[PDB]
Nucleic acid binder design. Structure first.
Lengths: 1031, 229
RNA sequence: GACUACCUCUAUAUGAAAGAGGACUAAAACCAUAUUUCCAAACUCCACUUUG
């Protein structure tokens, strides 16, 4: 009934297999029509649905088993004849019942007085129990008088199971045989021929919509109206109107389609199946506006019709489009979209090196020459030392800037074109052209020495990374040789060859949750021993958390993800730990066990596919994602078995030493990367660490869906180039005078953020005198864009900068003690939960929790960390904006090339596009400065919130993409710990304007509590809303 | 009790910050002075009868949390028998009870959020455990105190007849003997702790104060047992 | 319902098309972050939100 699909039927799952010739219900890996016998076994749940469909909502438990045994034979048991008689039957019956129900049989032809059947269930049930004279009702006798009801339910099941079965078989792809499919096809051909498909004013006169929408208002404005009921009787009035116009709903097919759109508008704004939550507006259902909207959401189905088979013409599968290959197009466009948005951010950095004022495509060949002409030469050398660790000369800046744009352009031009890709010959790029044309190789170019000074420094980046986290200080030199000298494991730049592999902080934090447990119930013991501490404000813990982080990423993940035996032995532990205890409620019940000679990438490709097929069903009902905690426990148990089978279990005991060990840590390392990866590396050096990590995650999802045995070797070679660029990441300069030319140019710049006599202090000078120290978030902003934007932000008010009370706030208390107390008090609350109801105790706890939050906003403000938070927040808004404008870029090639399939030919292409009111030159202007990151280059023009208003004038093309733009702004800001509210759109002339911005709350100490804290601060929220609204 | 209800818009007036004993009791007295008329023809003699025992001072309200699939059942027990009950959706529709902000990120629906209001209105709540399809126990409780019992063989009809017997035993224990003596010891301990804090605000951190809380908790636990007796 | 989606099929036009479907289409979720929120376990089928 509810779920035809995604349901076990013969201990086998059910899928639907769509085809251009029809629909098909199929099991899991089969291809047969099983739509007859799946639908026949799905019939003991139609009986269970009808019993709910005849009973009232405060369900009397014994009227619910009379009915269920009158239909099913096995379901029927025994009940006292007197007990049903004592109760009043009318009160427990459904609303359709309690009066006379009339129905016609399915088989009966036409409607006649004789054919209609009358049933008074309350009267009928009363007379049958009157004839029942026994301690318990006798099934043959009672059922026989119930025959007029049993014939109703059989008819109800057989007719509803026949409409569902017809709905599945007709659900074909790009249909032209259905009503509403032929109609859409008819309107689509009256637009390519530039005509008018429909007239709203003439179809609204046949519909008599003046007779509606005044009876809709006469119900809404009716006296004694109830907001709990008004949507249900606005439904009845609409249905009553159709009943009167029914003679030409069956014979017009556009007066029928006009009815479905006004049926659908009525339950988005006056909903009936949606948890009401709000009163509808009488603005919503008035003549003139209700036919403004129907014109707008019937043109939307024509535009979704055009691009859905412009997609079927780009990929040459317009006759053999299967359910599987639409699912295959969905994967390869997830990787192509992800790979475009990293070529646009690297094109942004190549903009800033060469000419920061250009607002066009610099990766165009000719327009790069006009951008190369105007280069501030002193800035390019200082910028080159940040992206690359090497120093460039004056004579080499003619040829290194053509070597960079020749690394983005041949890759970015192949990906954008919506056609068949060859992923070999996508990552070679031997040459690059230099016009003034002379094609230079990359092998004989200056860039080659940026590899063997780079691939050969991998064993010292590991050693110098360890010193930064103080791993060497808390561990002896003989205790790090046995973590790189293990057989087979050998410090790979690869991270994981399996999709949906967790991160380390998800593994370490949740692995702490399974080891340290209350030990008072039927324990779910995973036999864990290393997830020991969580004290992030210590430094002995911060050494072991960082040593566990790189044992796991650089050694454990590459081996564990490719050993069939290692992965299976951890999957087989988690399955037999779950389904070996008493009861039926067991979560990992319906997921299969890993086969032998099965690669771990083929098992987790199954776990990926089950996680995404069951996402709609897990959100209908409030169900947790049991696949997410399955992937946890396999990797939590997997990293514990690694660290104990090998003797590396001392990592749990740091034990800071005093004796200085001047010993060497030799690690082995080998890599077979030849000098053909020397153009994809140049793109990865222009990306930020967050961008590199998330493109590597999408590259492994796509690589675990390809079939050829090479061209996966292409991806796992490009995936190692990513990991060689994450090793460098955030080096930065160490000499002071290589980022500033004077002591006064430093002091001029750093006084945009503290602006006082506080620069001659201990956090801002080195240790003594007047030698400056450099801030790691003040050149992180100079490296990327955002440097002329964050200067505009902090120059607005003088309270944003560091003042004299902020440093004086860092000497008020000890701070470490506050955290020590906040921990002791919290621990106590677990053993004595009645401390929450002790006002004096909760008043103290809250005070101690405030002293932490005020100190840490003071700690971050003093070190200018909050400048890095603003830069990260700014990047995630402009790139999500750029991800929408490349979806509109795809739709332009799916609608334009369909017109060309039907300036000689370019004249007839664009003149169609202004008749549909598609992509303009005013929208291609708005689609360019979003996708080319032109907010960053200083001069504002429009704010950030006026770019999200530009994004939904470009994407008003369809409402699926138009409605989701503003839902994504609220989710990006909620990730950074804030809220946003947005004053209504009909009052602010359809613009986004901030109603309220507040820090997210954390809600300590229980569930019905008032002790809470802000996730950021009130001073940061003020800083954030002046970045959004800033021209 | 725990006084914690979400902002509620009732019959055009918004009640906010309902996290104290004074703002909850200002909302309950608004609900009984709130006028109404009931519209139904089948249930005129039933629903208007339910809002009369409840309005009367000598009446006990029973919540019975998740009675059916999506249905709560408010029961009013009169002083001499007479247990009637309506669905809680009828109660919300007659008194026009909503949420003030239904779209805040820290809220759920009215089927989840109204349980905080109903555990401040009622005296007894009932929550069936349904151990593997069939029932197991009923788990009675008091809302002023937190004395929780666990009916084992009682049916829905049988259970209502037991709630007046459940209320009588708890009230008699509180009135005299052990409750009077046990309550006094807890009050003396609280005063000592309160005074201890006053000398120094840092007394809570000290182990001696922490040890004192353990004694108070033990006394409270012992006190509930006297009520169950 | 911009937030608080969208599309496809379905006609005894009503106990209702108030039905099913969607990795098929989007958004999320997943991913190398700077720290306070105790935690673990919790199979499947079926109702459908109304003073009627």
């Amino acid at each position: 009934t509810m779920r035809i699909t995604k349901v076990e039927v013969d201990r086998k799952k059910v899928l639907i297999s769509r085809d251009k010739n029809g629909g098909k219900l199929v099991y899991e890996n089969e291809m047969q029509d099983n739509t007859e016998q799946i639908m026949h076994h799905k019939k003991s749940s139609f009986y269970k649905s009808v019993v709910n469909k005849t009973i009232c909502r405060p369900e009397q438990k014994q009227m619910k088993k009379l009915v269920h045994g009158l239909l099913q034979e096995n379901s029927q048991e025994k009940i006292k004849v007197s007990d049903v008689t004592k109760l009043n039957i009318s009160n427990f019956l459904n609303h359709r019942f309690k009066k006379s129900l009339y129905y016609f049989p399915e088989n009966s032809p036409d409607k006649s007085e004789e054919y209609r059947i009358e049933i008074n269930l309350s009267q009928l049930l009363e007379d049958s129990l009157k004839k029942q004279q026994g301690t318990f009702i006798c099934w043959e006798s009672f059922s026989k008088d119930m025959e007029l009801y049993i014939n109703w339910a059989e008819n109800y099941i057989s007719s509803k199971t026949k409409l569902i079965k017809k709905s599945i078989r007709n659900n074909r792809i790009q249909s032209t045989e259905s009503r509403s499919g032929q109609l859409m096809d008819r309107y689509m051909k009256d637009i390519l021929n530039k005509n008018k498909p429909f007239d709203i004013q003439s179809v609204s006169e046949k519909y008599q919509l003046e007779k509606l929408t005044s009876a809709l208002k006469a119900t809404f404005k009716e006296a004694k109206k109830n907001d709990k009921e008004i949507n249900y009787k606005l439904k009845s009035t609409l249905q009553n109107h159709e009943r009167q116009i029914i003679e030409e709903l069956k014979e017009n097919s556009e007066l029928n389609q006009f009815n479905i759109e006004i049926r659908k508008h009525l339950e988005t704004y006056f909903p009936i199946k949606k948890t009401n939550r709000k009163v509808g507006d009488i603005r919503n259902l008035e003549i003139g506006e209700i036919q403004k909207i129907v014109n707008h959401r019937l043109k939307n189905k024509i535009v979704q019709r055009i691009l859905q088979e412009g997609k079927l013409a780009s990929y040459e599968i317009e006759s053999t489009v299967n359910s599987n290959s639409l699912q295959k197009i969905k994967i390869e466009e997830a990787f192509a979209l992800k790979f475009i948005n990293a070529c646009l951010f690297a094109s942004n950095n190549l903009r800033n090196m060469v000419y920061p004022v250009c607002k066009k495509d610099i990766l165009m060949i000719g327009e790069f020459k006009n951008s190369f002409k105007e280069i501030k030469h002193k800035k390019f050398i200082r910028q080159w030392s940040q992206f690359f660790s090497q120093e460039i000369t004056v004579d080499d800046i003619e040829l290194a800037s053509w070597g960079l744009r020749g690394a983005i352009a041949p890759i970015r031009n192949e990906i954008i074109h919506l056609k068949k890709h060859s992923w070999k010959k996508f990552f070679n790029n031997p040459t690059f052209k230099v016009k003034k044309t002379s094609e230079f190789l990359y092998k004989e170019t200056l860039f080659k020495d940026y590899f063997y000074s780079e691939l050969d420094s991998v064993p010292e980046l590991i050693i110098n990374k360890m010193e930064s986290s103080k791993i060497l200080d808390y561990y002896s030199s003989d205790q790090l040789n046995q973590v790189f000298t293990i057989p087979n494991f050998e410090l790979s730049l690869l991270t994981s060859a399996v999709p949906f592999a967790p991160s380390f902080k998800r593994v370490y934090l949740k692995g702490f949750d399974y080891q340290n447990q209350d030990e008072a119930q039927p324990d779910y013991n995973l036999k864990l021993n290393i997830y020991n501490e969580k004290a992030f404000n210590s430094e002995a813990f911060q050494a072991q958390y960082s040593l566990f982080k790189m044992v796991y990423y650089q050694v454990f993940l590459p081996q564990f993800t490719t050993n069939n035996d290692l992965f299976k032995s951890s999957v087989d532990f988690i399955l037999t730990l779950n389904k070996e205890r008493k009861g039926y409620a067991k979560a990992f019940q319906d997921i299969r066990k890993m086969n032998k000679d099965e690669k771990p990438s083929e098992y987790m490709s199954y776990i990926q596919s089950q996680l995404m097929l069951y996402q709609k069903k897990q959100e209908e009902k409030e169900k947790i994602n049991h696949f997410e905690k399955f992937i946890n426990q396999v990797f939590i148990k997997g990293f514990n078995s690694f660290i104990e089978k090998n003797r590396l279990t001392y990592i749990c005991h740091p034990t800071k030493n005093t004796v200085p060990e001047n010993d060497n840590i030799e690690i082995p390392f080998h890599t077979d990367m030849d000098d053909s990866n020397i153009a994809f590396w140049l793109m990865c050096k222009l990306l930020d660490a967050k961008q590199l990590s998330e493109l590597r995650n999408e590259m492994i999802k796509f690589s675990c869906s390809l079939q050829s045995t090479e061209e996966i070797s292409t991806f796992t070679k490009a995936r190692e180039v990513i990991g060689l660029a994450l090793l460098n990441g955030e080096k930065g300069c160490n000499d002071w005078k290589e980022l500033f030319d004077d002591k006064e140019a430093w002091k001029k710049n750093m006084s945009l953020y503290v602006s006082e006599e506080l620069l001659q202090s201990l956090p801002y000078t080195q240790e003594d005198g007047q030698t400056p120290v450099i801030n790691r978030s003040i050149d992180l902003v100079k490296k990327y864009g955002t440097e002329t934007i964050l200067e505009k932000l902090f120059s607005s008010s003088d309270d944003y900068k560091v003042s004299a009370k902020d440093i004086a706030k860092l000497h008020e208390y000890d701070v470490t003690e506050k955290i020590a107390q906040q921990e002791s008090l919290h621990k106590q609350w677990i053993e004595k939960p009645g401390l929450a109801r002790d006002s004096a105790w909760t008043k103290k706890y809250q005070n101690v929790i405030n002293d932490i939050s005020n100190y840490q906003w003071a700690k971050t403000k003093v070190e200018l960390t909050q400048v890095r938070h603003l830069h990260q927040l700014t990047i995630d808004l402009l790139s999500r904006l750029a991800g929408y404008m490349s979806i509109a870029d795809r739709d332009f090639q799916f609608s334009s090339n369909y017109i060309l399939e039907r300036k000689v030919d370019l004249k007839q292409l664009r003149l169609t596009l202004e008749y549909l009111e598609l992509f303009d030159n005013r929208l291609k202007e708005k689609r360019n400065n979003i996708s080319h990151f032109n907010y960053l280059n200083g001069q504002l023009g429009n704010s950030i919130l006026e770019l999200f208003d530009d994004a939904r004038d470009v994407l008003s093309y369809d409402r699926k993409l138009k409605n989701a733009v503003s839902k994504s702004l609220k989710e990006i800001l909620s990730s950074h710990g804030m809220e946003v509210t947005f004053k209504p759109l009909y009052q602010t002339n359809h613009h986004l304007k901030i109603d309220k911005l507040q820090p997210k709350k954390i809600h300590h100490l229980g569930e019905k509590s008032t002790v809470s804290s802000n996730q950021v601060s009130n001073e940061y929220c003020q800083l954030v809303r002046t970045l959004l609204t800033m021209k | 009790m725990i006084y914690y209800i979400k902002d509620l818009k009732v019959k055009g007036k918004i009640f906010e910050n309902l996290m104290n004993k004074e703002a909850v009791e200002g909302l309950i007295t608004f609900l009984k002075k709130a006028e109404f008329e009931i519209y139904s023809r089948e249930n005129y003699s039933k629903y208007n009868k339910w809002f009369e025992m409840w309005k009367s001072p000598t009446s006990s309200l029973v919540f019975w949390k998740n009675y059916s699939f999506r249905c709560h059942l408010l029961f009013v027990i009169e002083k001499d028998g007479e247990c009637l009950g309506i669905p809680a959706s009828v109660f919300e529709s007659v008194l026009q009870i909503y949420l003030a902000d239904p779209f805040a990120p820290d809220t759920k629906e009215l089927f989840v959020e109204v349980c905080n209001l109903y555990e401040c209105l009622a005296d007894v709540t009932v929550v069936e455990h349904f151990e593997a399809e069939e029932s197991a126990w009923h788990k009675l409780t008091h809302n002023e105190t937190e004395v929780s019992k666990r009916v084992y063989s009682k049916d829905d009809d049988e259970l209502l007849k037991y709630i007046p017997e459940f209320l009588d035993t708890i009230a008699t224990n509180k009135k005299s003997q052990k409750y009077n003596q046990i309550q006094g010891k807890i009050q003396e301990i609280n005063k000592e702790i309160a005074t201890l804090y006053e000398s120094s605000e840092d007394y809570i951190f000290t182990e001696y104060v922490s040890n004192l809380y353990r004694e108070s908790a033990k006394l409270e636990q012992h006190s509930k047992q006297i009520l169950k007796e």
